[PDB]
Amino acid sequence: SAMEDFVRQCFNPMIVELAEKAMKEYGEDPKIETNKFVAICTHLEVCFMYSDFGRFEIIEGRDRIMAWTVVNSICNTTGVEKPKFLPDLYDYKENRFIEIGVTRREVHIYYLEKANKIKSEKTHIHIFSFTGEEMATKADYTLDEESRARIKTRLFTIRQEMASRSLWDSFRQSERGE
Ligand SMILES: O=C1c2c(O)c(=O)ccn2N([C@@H]2c3ccccc3SCc3c2ccc(F)c3F)[C@@H]2COCCN12
Ligand SMILES: [Mn+2]
Ligand SMILES: [Mn+2]
């Protein structure tokens, strides 16, 4: 599959290895769900960039046990309420958990979907598209504009490499089902 080749060529081996472990956890095959594979790599990379953007602890890219160990440690030392689902980051400055979303759809739709899912006002949502759009809880985008710019540039680049390989249309229609 050209998509698996693109994923392994454009993404860091550490990212790819972590995405493959996540996919194994949920019983998904990166050789069949290749578009998801690349989606998981992309969002992992966004989360890592966001975190180095500070300030942030990363919850994503860890296995469930260690990830919940970190979340509980945070809730014990800061007293922030325990989230109902694994978030992606913890903000020590604003002392709040953060869910990152990356969409090939309109950011407002994905934001509404995420907010309906977590149903907890406490966790902050930050949605990124592949064309520079973003939607965040209370339009509190957390990061400075240079940092968000670097994230947005990397996402657009991925979209354009996919486009270069005639992979973008398939990728786009894979996010939502019928
Ligand atoms: O952590 C996440 C997750 C997010 O944090 C997210 O933002 C979007 C989507 N997620 N989901 C991720 C995921 C992460 C990034 C991009 C796409 C996917 S798509 C479903 C799936 C995920 C992981 C492995 C796998 F095999 C999957 F099928 C699942 C939902 O619940 C549990 C963990 N998780
Ligand atoms: Mn996550
Ligand atoms: Mn996320």
Side-chain angles (χ1 to χ4, degrees), residues 20-52 54-62 64-65 67-80 82-83:
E20 283 177 291
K21 296 231 64 83
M23 288 198 84
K24 260 118 55 163
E25 274 182 11
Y26 290 79
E28 305 281 296
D29 198 332
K31 316 278 281 273
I32 164 175
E33 310 273 35
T34 49
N35 289 341
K36 186 172 309 191
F37 186 29
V38 80
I40 291 154
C41 285
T42 292
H43 156 282
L44 250 173
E45 193 172 348
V46 168
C47 287
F48 289 166
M49 284 172 81
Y50 212 107
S51 75
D52 205 28
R55 196 193 158 164
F56 301 94
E57 194 53 71
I58 62 112
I59 328 290
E60 185 65 280
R62 307 176 182 252
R64 300 171 216 244
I65 297 172
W68 276 113
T69 296
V70 172
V71 168
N72 298 349
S73 174
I74 281 152
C75 296
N76 291 331
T77 56
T78 69
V80 172
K82 232 190 280 223

Side-chain angles (χ1 to χ4, degrees), residues 43 47 60 88 99-102 110 114:
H43 156 282
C47 287
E60 185 65 280
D88 295 289
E99 172 68 19
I100 297 305
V102 179
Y110 197 41
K114 233 80 163 73

Side-chain angles (χ1 to χ4, degrees), residues 92-170:
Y92 286 111
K93 211 166 235 73
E94 301 260 35
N95 283 296
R96 65 185 164 211
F97 284 107
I98 305 140
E99 172 68 19
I100 297 305
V102 179
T103 182
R104 316 133 236 185
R105 280 139 82 222
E106 322 266 50
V107 283
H108 72 248
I109 298 152
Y110 197 41
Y111 180 87
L112 295 182
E113 278 178 11
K114 233 80 163 73
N116 195 30
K117 190 278 172 43
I118 54 139
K119 260 159 208 103
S120 162
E121 297 238 82
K122 212 198 217 273
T123 295
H124 208 92
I125 309 147
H126 197 163
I127 309 282
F128 281 102
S129 89
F130 286 80
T131 58
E133 319 275 41
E134 54 174 5
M135 179 151 309
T137 300
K138 295 302 298 193
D140 186 356
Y141 298 106
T142 297
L143 303 168
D144 40 331
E145 305 230 68
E146 181 158 22
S147 287
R148 291 137 73 201
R150 291 225 181 261
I151 293 167
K152 288 160 181 218
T153 297
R154 179 65 182 134
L155 291 175
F156 194 81
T157 301
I158 292 159
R159 163 178 176 153
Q160 291 308 309
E161 298 268 29
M162 283 189 185
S164 161
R165 297 153 164 81
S166 292
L167 303 180
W168 175 252
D169 258 45
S170 180

